[PDB]
Design a protein around this ligand. Structure first.
Ligand SMILES: N=C(N)NCCCCCN1CC[C@]23c4c5ccc(O)c4O[C@H]2c2nc4ccccc4cc2C[C@@]3(O)[C@H]1C5
Lengths: 285, 232, 215, 55, 338
């Protein structure tokens, strides 16, 4: 399994480097000529912050998989777990609020004239950052490592019934981190696409294929990236908490780490998606 | 332009009172407000300050913690809440307009004032001269000495001259050192450098009699000087 | 800083806040430029210097700017309307035969100059075709031959009106980022404000797409 | 029209009978003014930071 | 007799041209080629004045070389304390379509005007703390493009009705009206002695006027496009113009003809504003290429470039002591250069 471990480590390193480079480029562009005078610019900066702070974490789990041990103590165990949960919730909520903001911009323009302001965008971003801390604080508290099962591992501690409690928090995380955000994103973008079909953007050639097709391609790219970079981890933890499959199988471990690689590729490719899909970034030569 | 104060009257020691001031005739919200008191046989003393927008509030050390200053801009009223009244706060309280920008004339307007009677470090300004005998048509000089140089790095010497006529509220003559005020005849001249300052009246008049006070606005608290009384 | 320089800075901050509030209130408003020939009639859609009329239609604040009293070089003051939401252009269909040079050709030249202006490249135009009743009653006697020697069509209100509108939008160049909205002015109805409302709503949607950066 | 041409030719006649100097004299005067005030020109020569109020 | 009058006018023009040609012996460049040039002038931005939310069209310094006033499309007349970047006053305007602004030499009044065809006068010094409008001057039939104070009671205005006017602020009346331009007058420049003033219009001509008598003394015709900017030399015996032909020309009052031409092959945008240095050696001009070019007046050589604005430079002006240059532009920013 040496070749498999080398491939997994190389994938982790490439994903982390790509994410860090993309986040650095995004912040440099925002500082230079993409100043936060617009709500979507504020949301782009916030997503870049969440993606970078999440990307600073991946080498820790890479070394954890490479060493099969936890030299990080209960201290950095609780730290890495809280950071992972915090970054997950903040990035998901920022994407959801981007979808809602675009839907309000297109479908309700008269009220969007007052609602879409930099002050309200900053307030909403602050509320999003604060709200996920209320879910990360129990991850700060109830996360202490153990020298069990032949090594040092991390596991959330719950009172009786511990199985009921861990199933409850897994179900709540899946419901309020994946399903509700994806439903809101798809509903908002579909209503936005219907309004964009109605408005004077599809009336002749070199207009529909130049604007509406590009908009549709962008929204399917965003939703598909979300699906393909957040579905395998959630279905894998669901099947883990549902059925009892070998926890030491090398193929199972490789599949789980590939799922984690896809989840980190989400934050690696979101800044690249903004760089290659923002028409404002395309205009900003 | 008129500031009319209300309140005052007899009050037992340790009591409470609230002084009011109705402003009418100017843009009240754009002016910072000062409270200045004067003992029945002594000079002026600064009490409290509130800025435009009620951002910064400054109090005198002898009044801090017991006095509260506030303003109500929509109703054009200024307040001074008094708590735990002592026998050392019996005086006549004045309200002073004050605006602040480049080229301003702070302390330009004063109110008539109301008297409060209670039943039975900062730099200093020295005016050693008192009861100076004067005659009409003469030239006199009134000197004020401070304890620190009032010349700031901005190049402004922060010395204010006031004239309190008998039975009248004090009036600003010169706001910054050598800067005549509006409505003041061009016979009052301001001069000085650093610590020593002088006010020169080239030609006198019967309306120029009174008590001349010297104030500093370089740093809080604002400190006056025992005025040099002019008399015939 | 001295005791008065600090107060000066406080005053400066206070009027900074006032400027920001005023700018937000101004940015929550749409601006319209009223153009057209004098004989077309700019007072039909409403009822020294330039005249500003303000009206509110379903929670949207409007700012009309009639510049018909400025008898000067337009090239020296047309750039101050660079950021207008839309242009309302009034052309009377009744003046296809009256001559002060036909009035209709004067309107065509003015429309051509405004539409292809270097300041209004992506600025939408709300074309208003006025005097529908007089034009309908007049086309039964004088045809479109005087206005158009190359018409070669019939003599009815619908066909002639459609032909005039088609030619006026054919004057438009670079029909990719610009939209010309054409409406026939209604006498006993309040649909003109509704039409302007839809045009400005489309412009707001376009501006929001451009701001959100997915256009 | 009619009186406009008369006004134009009258203005041209008034402008024609004017005292004039050579271009060399005017250029010399401009050069002399520029040379006589070059010292008191902060935009031309470098200014010390102490004297400059915009730091 | 229209043909005869036209022939007489043509003969008079030919006589004036012959006199102008006879008065020229050696060009300005010929007798300034032996003067020492200044190599390069690197002026950095010392202050950036923020607060405007629309396009800046005009600004004017005060006499004290510390206060300045700026006008924008946001409807605000802002007085700045340039030494600390402090804002002294923020005057709302009844009409937001302002195109010019001025500072009274006494520092008590600020004027503005534009598409409303009204020159408004505002009182900075007032017993109350607010700036109040003194009176509105009406009578122009076009937009006001420039206005300059003679004193507290006299102001001169230029309008788009091909007419300059002199007003009396005591009574709000036209003391003297100036006629003769066939195009819209765009710029004004009071002489240092405030006895004459020049105006450049859309007829590609600049006219020297007499304030007291009210007639036109000289007419200068070298430009091929409409003149947007005009400014007097510090000595009052010359003036410089700027038009949309990407060209600045220096005219002489006594020699009655053009002296020097300031143009470059790579410059094609028009000139929006122009000003002189304290000694008259430098000619600063604002262009439509987001730049301000510093010209050596006696050498017609580009001595520097002020490149700090992202939109069109619409106005500039040098302080009375030559300490700084304030450049306003269409990006809603004012920049102080030294
Ligand atoms: N887009 C950005 N910003 N991505 C950067 C952050 C990416 C990683 C986020 N992190 C969050 C916490 C975590 C997790 C994920 C999905 C669903 C969960 O229920 C869940 O619980 C954790 C978890 N529990 C496990 C329990 C048993 C066996 C395996 C488990 C594997 C994991 C993985 C995981 O650590 C993981 C995903």
């Amino acid at each position: 399994s040496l070749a498999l471990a080398i491939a997994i480590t190389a994938l982790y390193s490439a994903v982390c480097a790509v994410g860090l480079l993309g986040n650095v480029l995004v912040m440099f562009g925002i500082v230079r000529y993409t100043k936060m005078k617009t709500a979507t610019n504020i949301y782009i900066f916030n997503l870049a912050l969440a993606d970078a702070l999440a990307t600073s974490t991946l080498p820790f789990q890479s070394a954890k998989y490479l060493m099969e041990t936890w030299p990080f103590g209960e201290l950095l165990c609780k730290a890495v777990l809280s950071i992972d949960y915090y970054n997950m919730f903040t990035s998901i909520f920022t994407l959801t609020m981007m979808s809602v903001d675009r839907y309000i911009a297109v479908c309700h323009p008269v009220k969007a004239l007052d609602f879409r302001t930099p002050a309200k965008a900053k307030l909403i971003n602050i509320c999003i950052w604060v709200l996920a801390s209320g879910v990360g604080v129990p991850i700060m508290v109830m996360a202490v490592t153990r020298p069990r099962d032949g090594a040092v591992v991390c596991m959330l501690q719950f009172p009786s019934p511990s199985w009921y409690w861990d199933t409850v928090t897994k179900i709540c995380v899946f419901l309020f981190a994946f399903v509700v955000p994806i439903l809101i994103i798809t509903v908002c973008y579909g209503l936005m696409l219907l309004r964009l079909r109605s408005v004077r953007l599809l009336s002749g050639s070199k207009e529909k294929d130049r604007s509406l097709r590009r908009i549709t391609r962008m929204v399917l790219v965003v939703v598909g990236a979300f699906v393909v970079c957040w579905a395998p981890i959630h279905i894998f933890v669901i099947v883990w908490t549902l059925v009892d499959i070998d926890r030491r199988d090398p193929l199972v471990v490789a599949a789980l780490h590939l799922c984690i690689a896809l989840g980190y590729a989400n934050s690696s490719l979101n800044p690249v998606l903004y760089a290659f899909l923002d028409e404002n970034f395309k205009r900003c030569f | 332009v008129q500031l009319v104060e209300s309140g005052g009257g007899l009050v037992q020691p340790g009591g409470s009172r609230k002084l009011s001031c109705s402003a009418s005739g100017f843009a009240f919200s754009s002016f910072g407000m000062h409270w200045v008191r004067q003992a029945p046989e002594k000079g002026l003393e600064w009490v409290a300050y509130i800025s435009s927008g009620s951002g910064t509030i400054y109090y005198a050390d002898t009044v801090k913690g017991r006095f509260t200053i506030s303003r109500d801009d929509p109703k054009n009223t200024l307040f001074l809440q008094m708590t735990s009244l002592r026998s050392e706060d019996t005086a006549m309280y004045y309200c002073v307009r004050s605006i602040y920008y480049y080229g301003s004339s702070p302390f330009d307007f004063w109110g008539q004032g109301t008297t409060l009677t209670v039943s039975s470090s900062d730099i200093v300004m020295t005016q050693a001269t008192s009861s100076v005998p004067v005659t009409p048509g003469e030239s006199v000089s009134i000197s004020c000495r401070s304890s620190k140089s009032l010349l700031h790095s901005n190049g402004n010497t922060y010395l204010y001259w006031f004239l309190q006529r008998p039975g009248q509220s004090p009036q600003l003559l010169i706001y910054r050192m050598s800067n005549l005020a509006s409505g003041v005849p061009d016979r009052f001249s301001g001069s000085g450098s650093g610590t020593a300052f002088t006010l020169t009246i080239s030609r006198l008049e019967a309306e120029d009699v009174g008590v001349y006070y010297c104030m500093q606005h370089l740093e809080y608290p604002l400190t006056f000087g025992a005025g040099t009384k002019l008399e015939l | 800083l001295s005791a008065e320089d600090k107060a000066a800075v406080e005053r400066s901050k206070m009027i900074d806040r006032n400027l920001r509030e005023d700018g937000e209130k101004a940015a929550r408003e749409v601006k319209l430029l009223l153009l057209g020939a004098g004989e077309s009639g700019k007072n039909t859609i409403v009822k020294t210097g330039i005249v500003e009329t303000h009206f509110t239609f379903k929670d949207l604040h409007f700012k009309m700017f009639d510049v018909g009293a400025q008898r000067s070089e337009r090239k020296k003051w047309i750039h101050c309307f660079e950021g207008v939401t839309a242009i309302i252009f009034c052309v009377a269909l009744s003046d296809y035969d009256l001559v002060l040079m036909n009035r209709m050709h004067a309107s065509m030249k003015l429309f051509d100059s405004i539409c292809n202006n270097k300041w209004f490249t992506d600025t939408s135009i709300i074309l208003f075709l006025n005097k529908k009743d007089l034009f309908e009653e007049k086309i039964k006697k004088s045809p479109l031959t005087i206005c158009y020697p190359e018409y070669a069509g019939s003599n009815t209100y619908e066909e002639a009106a459609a032909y005039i509108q088609c030619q006026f939008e054919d004057l438009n160049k670079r029909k990719d980022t610009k939209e010309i909205y054409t409406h026939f002015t209604c006498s006993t109805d309040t649909k003109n404000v509704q039409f302007v409302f839809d045009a400005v709503t489309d412009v707001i949607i376009k501006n929001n797409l451009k701001d959100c950066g997915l256009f | 029209s009619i009186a406009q041409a008369r006004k134009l030719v009258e203005q041209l006649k008034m402008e024609a009978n004017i005292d004039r100097i050579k271009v060399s004299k005017a250029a010399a005067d401009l050069m002399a003014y520029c040379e006589a005030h070059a010292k008191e020109d902060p935009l031309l020569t470098p200014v010390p930071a102490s004297e400059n109020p915009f730091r | 007799e229209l043909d005869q009058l036209r022939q007489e006018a043509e003969q008079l023009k030919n006589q004036i041209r012959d006199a102008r040609k006879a008065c020229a012996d050696a060009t300005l460049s010929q007798i300034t080629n032996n003067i020492d040039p200044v190599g390069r002038i690197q002026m950095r931005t010392r202050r950036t004045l923020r607060g405007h939310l629309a396009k800046i069209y005009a600004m004017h310094w005060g006499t004290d070389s510390r206060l300045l006033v700026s006008a924008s499309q946001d409807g605000k007349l802002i007085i700045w304390d340039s030494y600390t970047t402090n804002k002294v006053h923020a005057i709302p305007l009844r009409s937001s379509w302002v195109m010019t602004c001025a500072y009274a030499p006494s520092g008590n009044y600020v004027a503005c005007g534009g598409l409303d065809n009204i020159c408004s006068i505002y009182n900075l010094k007032t017993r109350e703390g607010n700036v109040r409008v003194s009176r509105e001057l009406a009578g122009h039939t076009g937009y006001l493009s420039c206005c300059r104070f003679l004193d507290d009671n006299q102001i001169v205005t230029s309008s788009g009705d091909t007419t300059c006017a002199l007003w009396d602020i005591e009574t709000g009346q036209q003391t003297t009206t100036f006629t003769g331009h066939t195009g819209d007058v765009m710029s004004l420049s009071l002489a240092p002695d405030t006895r004459l003033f020049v105006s450049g219009a859309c007829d590609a001509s600049a006219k020297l006027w007499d304030v007291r008598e009210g007639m036109c003394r000289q007419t200068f015709t070298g430009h091929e496009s409409d003149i947007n900017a005009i400014c007097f030399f510090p000595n009052g015996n010359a003036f410089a113009t700027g038009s949309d032909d990407a060209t600045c020309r220096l005219f002489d009052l006594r020699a009655d003809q053009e002296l020097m031409t300031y143009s470059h092959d790579n410059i094609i945008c028009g000139i929006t504003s122009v000003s002189f240095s304290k000694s008259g050696r430098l000619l600063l001009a604002g262009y439509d290429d987001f730049n301000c070019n510093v010209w050596d007046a006696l050498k017609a050589d580009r001595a520097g470039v002020l490149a700090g604005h992202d939109n069109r430079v619409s106005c500039l002006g040098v302080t009375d002591d030559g300490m700084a240059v304030a450049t306003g532009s269409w990006d809603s920013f004012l920049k102080i250069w030294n």
